[PDB]
Amino acid sequence: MGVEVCVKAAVGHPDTLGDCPFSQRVLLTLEEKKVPYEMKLIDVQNKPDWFLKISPEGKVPVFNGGDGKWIPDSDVITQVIEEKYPTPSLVTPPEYASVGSKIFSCFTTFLKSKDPNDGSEKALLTELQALEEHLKAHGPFINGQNISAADLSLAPKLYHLQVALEHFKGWKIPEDLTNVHAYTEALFSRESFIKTKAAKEHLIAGWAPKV
Template identity: 65%
Template sequence: MSTLRIQPSTTSAISSTIKNLHLGFSFRLPCKNYGVSKRPRNLSVMAVATDPLEVCVKASSTSPNRLGDCPFCQRVLLTIEEKHLPYDMKLVDLGNKPEWFLKISPEGKVPVIKLDEKWLPDSDVITQSLEEKYPDPPLGTPPEKASVGSKIFSTFIGFLKSKDPSDGSQQALLNELNSFNDYIKENGPFINGGKVSAADLSLGPKLYHLEIALGHYKNWSVADSLPHVKSYMKTIFSMDSFIKTRALPDDVIVGWRPKVFG
């Protein structure tokens, strides 16, 4: 197993923030896992991760010591990156799951993350828990916008697996992409307007897989008639956090091969 440690200088960031507030008094942090954010006219306590979060993710099947092709793992890593939290990424070979991993994830699924001394599975649960524990910066998506683009992934898979050009699977995907294109045109550049949110961090990795897998197996790409979808994808894919956590194209291709050929 390979481990990649990524730990920003949380302590220096807190010190800099305190120094710039010019409050005129000093205080001690209550414990190593929490920082106190002091602002003029308002006092608030905010959880700050100082010890790296432990997160288990899929390992690459084509290159050693690299992140694999799971879009749900990338979603979790994107959330951690966007919240500027330090983390310890544990790469798991899903073709040969180690015993230590099966003890914390009996179903053998990734991602799993350790929060408050408990291992949590499922990207939905993990990202919501991270939002609650580390609310700054906020990444929540309003409920009325949370499902925007949510059917793109399932229709992509349907089209990718299809062997019949006349079964309507391509049109089903185009319908979803057209709907998303119209939404972003009116509400973009992100799903929640001007700032990236949890919905983007979920959809972005899936669109990345769509672009690579359909390009390879179907010689298909998003049409120029969907400029807002293409612009959205370009914006998401160029984010530093996305570049840092994306899978290798070869892994995406290998990962979808069983769906294509059965």
């Protein structure tokens, strides 16, 4: 049957797409593979019962590939989509799987930090520098000329990084990391990314209580 995906609505705005980066990874995957799908927005503070019946732990995103079940976990979901819709191939080589894997967590720790000298900035910078070296050697995407799964996993997280760190801390990725800047400027301007990203005010609102 028809492909369907449940994703988070923006806080306080039930008919507006939210900022959940795992949801966005899934949506980016469907968009780039040109798969038709229906999107269902879930108010995670007011979940509807029909949703609780198919997602009993309230987990979002969940994906229905037309095979009579709803599955969680954006890793698993994007692999299922890869298997079902092989072209374009978004397979990322295993040796590039962990590229930028610590960026989001380092970002969250630095964002929530209220002590300038606790070392979280240095850690974030170290991970960004690793991304920079990888992109220099193997760019422009994580797997060269063709976009792939690792890009679609990483781009939503870098979007959070840029918007939230600039807003809350007035912090920006250093300009000498030119490959990272080319990377984020390229990814954020893709039609798929513009279509599936949160409005910045909603992303900022989402981070406000956590900060």
